[PDB]
Amino acid sequence: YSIMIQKILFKDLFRFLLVYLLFMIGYASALVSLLNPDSETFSTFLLDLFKLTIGMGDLEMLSSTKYPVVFIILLVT
Amino acid sequence: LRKAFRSGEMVTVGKSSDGTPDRRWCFRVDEVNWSHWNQNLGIINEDP
Amino acid sequence: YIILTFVLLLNMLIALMGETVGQVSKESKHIWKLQWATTILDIERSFPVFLRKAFRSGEMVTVGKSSDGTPDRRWCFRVDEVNWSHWNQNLGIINEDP
Amino acid sequence: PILFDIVSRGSTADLDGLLPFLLTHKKRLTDEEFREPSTGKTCLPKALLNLSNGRNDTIPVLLDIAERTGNMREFINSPFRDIYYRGQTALHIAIERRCKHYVELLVAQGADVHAQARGRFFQPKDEGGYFYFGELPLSLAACTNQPHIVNYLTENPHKKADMRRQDSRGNTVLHALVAIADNTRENTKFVTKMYDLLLLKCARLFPDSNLEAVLNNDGLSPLMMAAKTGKIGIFQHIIRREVTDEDTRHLSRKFKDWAYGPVYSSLYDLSSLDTCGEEASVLEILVYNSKIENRHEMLAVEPINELLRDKWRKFGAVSFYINVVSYLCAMVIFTLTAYYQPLEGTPPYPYRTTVDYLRLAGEVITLFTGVLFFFTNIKDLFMKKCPGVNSLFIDGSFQLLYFIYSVLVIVSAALYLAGIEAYLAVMVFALVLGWMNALYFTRGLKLTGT
Amino acid sequence: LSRKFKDWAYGPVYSSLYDLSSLDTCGEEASVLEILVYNSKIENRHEMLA
Ligand SMILES: CC(C)(O)c1cnc(N2C[C@@]3(CCC[C@](C)(Cn4cnc5ccc(C#N)cc54)C3)OC2=O)cn1
Numbered sequence: 001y002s003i004m005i006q007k008i009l010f011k012d013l014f015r016f017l018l019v020y021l022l023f024m025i026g027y028a029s030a031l032v033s034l035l036n037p038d039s040e041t042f043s044t045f046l047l048d049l050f051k052l053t054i055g056m057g058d059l060e061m062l063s064s065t066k067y068p069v070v071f072i073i074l075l076v077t
Numbered sequence: 078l079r080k081a082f083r084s085g086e087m088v089t090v091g092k093s094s095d096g097t098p099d100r101r102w103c104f105r106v107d108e109v110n111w112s113h114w115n116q117n118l119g120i121i122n123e124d125p
Numbered sequence: 126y127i128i129l130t131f132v133l134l135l136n137m138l139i140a141l142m143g144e145t146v147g148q149v150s151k152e153s154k155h156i157w158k159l160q161w162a163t164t165i166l167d168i169e170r171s172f173p174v175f176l177r178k179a180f181r182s183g184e185m186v187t188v189g190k191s192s193d194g195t196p197d198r199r200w201c202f203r204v205d206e207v208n209w210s211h212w213n214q215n216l217g218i219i220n221e222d223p
Numbered sequence: 224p225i226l227f228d229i230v231s232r233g234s235t236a237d238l239d240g241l242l243p244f245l246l247t248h249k250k251r252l253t254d255e256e257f258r259e260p261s262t263g264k265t266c267l268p269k270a271l272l273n274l275s276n277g278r279n280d281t282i283p284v285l286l287d288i289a290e291r292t293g294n295m296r297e298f299i300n301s302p303f304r305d306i307y308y309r310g311q312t313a314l315h316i317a318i319e320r321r322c323k324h325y326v327e328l329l330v331a332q333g334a335d336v337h338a339q340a341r342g343r344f345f346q347p348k349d350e351g352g353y354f355y356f357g358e359l360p361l362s363l364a365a366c367t368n369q370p371h372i373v374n375y376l377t378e379n380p381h382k383k384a385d386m387r388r389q390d391s392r393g394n395t396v397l398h399a400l401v402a403i404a405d406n407t408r409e410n411t412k413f414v415t416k417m418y419d420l421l422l423l424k425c426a427r428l429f430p431d432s433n434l435e436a437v438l439n440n441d442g443l444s445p446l447m448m449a450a451k452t453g454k455i456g457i458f459q460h461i462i463r464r465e466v467t468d469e470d471t472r473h474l475s476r477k478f479k480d481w482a483y484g485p486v487y488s489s490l491y492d493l494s495s496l497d498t499c500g501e502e503a504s505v506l507e508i509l510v511y512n513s514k515i516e517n518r519h520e521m522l523a524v525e526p527i528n529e530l531l532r533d534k535w536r537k538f539g540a541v542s543f544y545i546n547v548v549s550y551l552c553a554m555v556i557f558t559l560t561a562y563y564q565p566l567e568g569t570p571p572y573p574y575r576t577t578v579d580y581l582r583l584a585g586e587v588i589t590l591f592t593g594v595l596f597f598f599t600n601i602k603d604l605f606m607k608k609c610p611g612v613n614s615l616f617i618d619g620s621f622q623l624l625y626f627i628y629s630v631l632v633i634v635s636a637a638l639y640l641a642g643i644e645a646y647l648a649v650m651v652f653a654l655v656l657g658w659m660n661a662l663y664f665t666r667g668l669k670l671t672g673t
Numbered sequence: 674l675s676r677k678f679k680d681w682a683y684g685p686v687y688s689s690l691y692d693l694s695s696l697d698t699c700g701e702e703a704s705v706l707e708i709l710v711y712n713s714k715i716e717n718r719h720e721m722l723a
Pocket of ligand 1: 164167168171542543545546547549550551553595596597599600603618621622625663
């Protein structure tokens, strides 16, 4: 079991983290570039996006700034 | 309708005990073999 | 509704489990190899002809006299091996020196 | 009716009347009255098909009557007319039945040893036919594994069928031998033997020419033809062949450079494998146009895997990594340009501030990258044929996605021209698709490629 | 009294043809195929059908 934990932590966990970070950074740029009003607000909205990932969020926040439809499709994807 | 859409040919195999034709509904399959050379031959059509 | 949705999830899990993985463990290697080779060839074709000629694999070895005694001068590519079974069976005909 | 039965049972006895009759009535055996309306089959093919224990007593008598009646020539080589067997000659039947004695007896009197059997029946299996043997008597003898008939046909005092002749398709005896080549042992075992036999014989007879350098109508050659058709048994045999005899050692493709104890350094000829975009290298055809099922095994032959690895090391890794870095930087610039866009105002915006100049540089470089992606992908897609299933996973999907992303950027430009609301609808999709596409470059690393 | 004949041949291409006098009868004489697909033994049907 110790061998299993070590190999799971090292071999593929970082691989998954790299891919996951790739998609996360792409979506962060895409999502925040659409918003119309700045680094502090970027942090708040990134935290909100992470909250939506965990399963709790504010519906009005997503539809706060224009184009609700594209936001819905982006979040679904 | 089933008779109209019947698989196979109306091939004739050969003369019967009294010389009458067989005329049996058959279904052809073909193969490629490189091992046994000119072993036996096609007895029916005698032409591809 | 909920139970059947769970059943669909379970069924999808099983199908990915056996049929997909058994085949993947073998097919992924070959598909990746094909992708690697085709990217190599694409990178080659990107370069101009003269640059490709400059980066040409293999030697300019001469094999021997032709029918009229002229040299072959064929672009070859050497590979070497170690064999302990067949001893001094034939010999190197070209360099005649390692 | 009568004569066909007489000849069909091998009845030599019942041809007494025939010779007086033909002279008496000014008739010949090749006249239309004696031939099948459907196929035009004359007496001789009928006799050769109805062989009794390998020997029919009427072939010599028919030939004797034919010459005595004045028209041997028109008789020995009379083709079939039905579309299904067009061009087939009595010589084809003699060779196919595997009787050397009748092929000799038939060519001795003037049988055309070059007549082509090109009817629908004698076509590649993919084109509505059950046997394609090269469309020629010598190709028929070689393709049905009768080495003795080939040895006789090439060398006989009457008339010799040279090995360099091409059929209607352009296929020489070697393309024909590749065409029937299969990956079963029972097939390859004799395909390779006959291939080597014919090659050495043609080289010895005609020294200057190389039989393997004759291309068909499609521009392929026996090796290049076996590359894109999926024939390992003959493909690797051609690559690894070495001829020890000093007379014809020059037509070999694997030589032994040097040795010292248990260390043998040999060296393969890549005259055709790697040509550098001059003579349609075999490698490109093997990697693009080959058969998907067996490509993985064609690419593992002895001098090809090492060649690809060497090319990767020499110029493959650095260029790929430089490509990855450039793409990632371009997308970082695209993301930065998207983020800094002032959402207040209808474009085009006035570019006056240095930040506005930076944004304009980002905007223009984005379009340059988009048109570049359009340019190179369209070139690739036009260059390569449209793929199907089992090839989409290799590369198709990525050029599809790259095209979609480029199209999205192009439409983003048009909208940005006039419509304030429109252009932002899909320019974000552009970023999403681009970051999805960045997954392409994981193929360099095997762990990420899988 | 045979049920598989050899139609024709040319080199390494042999075309034979099976008799289906009883396999496929078109609902007249209790075809073997229907009995094999419905009434047969479940354990070995997969192999009878090959
Ligand atoms: C950043 C920059 C400018 O260097 C760059 C380079 N390539 C692309 N791609 C990548 C790609 C993806 C799909 C397969 C393609 C068409 C195969 N393919 C066709 N021609 C090639 C040349 C080199 C390579 C490599 N390595 C692959 C090639 C390549 O389509 C693009 O546009 C994008 N940006």
